[PDB]
Design a protein around this motif. Sequence first.
Motif, PDB file in Angstrom:
ATOM      1  N   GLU A   1       0.888  -1.314   0.151  1.00 32.67           N
ATOM      2  CA  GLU A   1       0.076  -0.210   0.313  1.00 32.67           C
ATOM      3  C   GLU A   1       0.842   0.976   0.070  1.00 32.67           C
ATOM      4  N   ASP A   2       2.421   1.488   0.270  1.00 32.35           N
ATOM      5  CA  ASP A   2       2.542   2.151   0.764  1.00 32.35           C
ATOM      6  C   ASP A   2       4.128   1.343   1.008  1.00 32.35           C
ATOM      7  N   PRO A   3       5.110   2.582   1.049  1.00 34.25           N
ATOM      8  CA  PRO A   3       6.156   1.971   1.622  1.00 34.25           C
ATOM      9  C   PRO A   3       7.038   1.545   3.276  1.00 34.25           C
ATOM     10  N   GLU A   4       5.502   2.142   3.558  1.00 35.33           N
ATOM     11  CA  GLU A   4       5.512   1.664   5.079  1.00 35.33           C
ATOM     12  C   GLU A   4       5.303   0.184   4.984  1.00 35.33           C
ATOM     13  N   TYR A   5       4.752  -0.104   4.459  1.00 31.71           N
ATOM     14  CA  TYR A   5       4.800  -1.545   4.553  1.00 31.71           C
ATOM     15  C   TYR A   5       6.016  -2.605   4.220  1.00 31.71           C
ATOM     16  N   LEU A   6       7.376  -2.213   4.289  1.00 35.77           N
ATOM     17  CA  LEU A   6       7.846  -2.655   4.872  1.00 35.77           C
ATOM     18  C   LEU A   6       9.053  -2.102   5.450  1.00 35.77           C
ATOM     19  N   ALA A   7       8.473  -1.609   6.545  1.00 30.59           N
ATOM     20  CA  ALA A   7       8.953  -0.795   7.848  1.00 30.59           C
ATOM     21  C   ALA A   7       9.714  -2.163   8.199  1.00 30.59           C
ATOM     22  N   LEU A   8       9.344  -3.245   8.466  1.00 38.37           N
ATOM     23  CA  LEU A   8      10.061  -4.107   9.813  1.00 38.37           C
ATOM     24  C   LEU A   8      10.752  -4.939   7.971  1.00 38.37           C
ATOM     25  N   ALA A   9      11.026  -5.483   7.476  1.00 39.17           N
ATOM     26  CA  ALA A   9      11.766  -5.822   6.618  1.00 39.17           C
ATOM     27  C   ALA A   9      13.532  -5.738   6.407  1.00 39.17           C
ATOM     28  N   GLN A  10      13.846  -6.623   6.364  1.00 37.68           N
ATOM     29  CA  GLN A  10      15.056  -6.768   6.446  1.00 37.68           C
ATOM     30  C   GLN A  10      15.202  -5.483   4.945  1.00 37.68           C
ATOM     31  N   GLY A  11      16.651  -4.807   5.360  1.00 36.93           N
ATOM     32  CA  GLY A  11      17.066  -3.441   3.779  1.00 36.93           C
ATOM     33  C   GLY A  11      16.798  -4.058   2.873  1.00 36.93           C
ATOM     34  N   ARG A  12      17.297  -5.392   2.440  1.00 41.15           N
ATOM     35  CA  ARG A  12      17.744  -5.888   1.428  1.00 41.15           C
ATOM     36  C   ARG A  12      16.572  -6.711   0.588  1.00 41.15           C
ATOM     37  N   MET A  13      15.673  -6.453   1.374  1.00 45.20           N
ATOM     38  CA  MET A  13      14.423  -7.356   0.959  1.00 45.20           C
ATOM     39  C   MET A  13      13.855  -6.080   0.353  1.00 45.20           C
ATOM     40  N   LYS A  14      13.707  -4.723   1.440  1.00 46.08           N
ATOM     41  CA  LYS A  14      12.745  -3.682   1.177  1.00 46.08           C
ATOM     42  C   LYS A  14      13.323  -3.710   0.036  1.00 46.08           C
TER      43      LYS A  14
END
Lengths: 248, 266
Positions: B213-226
């Motif tokens: 929905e928004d890049p915030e969705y990946l806030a908890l993901a690892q850096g690379r993954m993000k």
Amino acid sequence: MIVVKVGGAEGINYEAVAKDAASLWKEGVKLLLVHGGSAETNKVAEALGHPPRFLTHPVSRLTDRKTLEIFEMVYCGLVNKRLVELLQKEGANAIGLSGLDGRLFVGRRKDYTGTVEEVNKALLDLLLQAGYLPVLTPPALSYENEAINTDGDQIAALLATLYGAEALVYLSNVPGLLAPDEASLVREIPVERIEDPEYLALAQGRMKRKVMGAVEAVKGGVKRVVFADGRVENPIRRALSGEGTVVR
Amino acid sequence: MIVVKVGGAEGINYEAVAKDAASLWKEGVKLLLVHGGSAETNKVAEALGHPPRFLTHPGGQVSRLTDRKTLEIFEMVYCGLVNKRLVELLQKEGANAIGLSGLDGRLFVGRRKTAVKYVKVKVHRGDYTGTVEEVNKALLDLLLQAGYLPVLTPPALSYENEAINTDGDQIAALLATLYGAEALVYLSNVPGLLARYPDEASLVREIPVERIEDPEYLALAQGRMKRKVMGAVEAVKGGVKRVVFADGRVENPIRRALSGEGTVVR
């Protein structure tokens, strides 16, 4: 069309070569550049713990797989991209290619060494017409699709004959054919003689080796071959003006 | 059009990649290959007595400190070793490959990093790294229409005509969007996108674009993954039908990626 072969001996002034080639290219002069990288290859091979080996025929780099990889790293990576960048900086739209690319140079393998018998002239013509300046280099592709070390001087000669070049220029770390001094330079050599096998049989190894490319070209129709200094400014323009050894 | 990015991580099976790409090309499938060479570059750099130096960025991402000498080693490996290795393998398989770097014909052009910040936070300068913002599509189209299979690699050319190290993954993504590729394939030394990298158990099989929905969705993901996901999401938003992260160590790596093996972003 003018074919320019940049030697691989230590001392070549790539900046000066790029500057002059670009200037000529921007003027509308059709050009094909072929370069080398023997000296720099020997150094890298040394540093990588894989000392060069030359074998003496009655010299040539003993080219095994590993050596061919180092050869590619330096010729195709270091030198080719160095020259392409220098040319782009000078405003010339250079495109660098090895003989493997688009099967640009194909020949027979002898050791991964061989000759070049066919050139993908259609590819070069396509690029020339689209406004690019081809910067070419070995290795070549064998008839069995194997990358092989090959003589850059012969590549340039073959290109010159296929295009009926008005001039084939060989640039090295000396003012021209030196019969190591520098007053000791030969000014001219009529085509008729340079082609005669009796003449060549009297030459020192140094000279017989350095002129073989010029020998093939003139017999193929090339009107003028010149050996000049690749260490000075305007190296190409000066070679085209007669400075060095002129054959014709 | 299908764009395939061959990773630079250790373990890539070039023979398998070339055999598969060549077979697809000989079947009339339009392809563009982009490769790397980071792992092999690191090794060669060490051997030549110029150990790699990496800058851990303030935001976690790691980048190779690229001075002039490192750039030359970079070119030797990427443009010489890997590029010509792959071109030869493809020619052996009957595919008329033509290898090019971003410098050639101004294939890839971008902006050189004016200054790079790394972790307190310091700012390094004199780095020959940058982004790619433009591709010489006319050159690629000319070669494709003439029957050549492009095998592409960084460096890119800056706007000041300087060779610069740049992200090959972004080059591949840009190419894919410009061609509206039916698929963008990323081959690496892992089966796919792992949320808990390198735990192969954490493999994410499918990622719908609408989910992020928004890049915030990946806030908890690892850096690379993000970064991998956001890039793929942008690529899709850019017109790429699907992006796949797959294994470049196996046989038929491209075909398997296209059949859904690995991580598929849509």
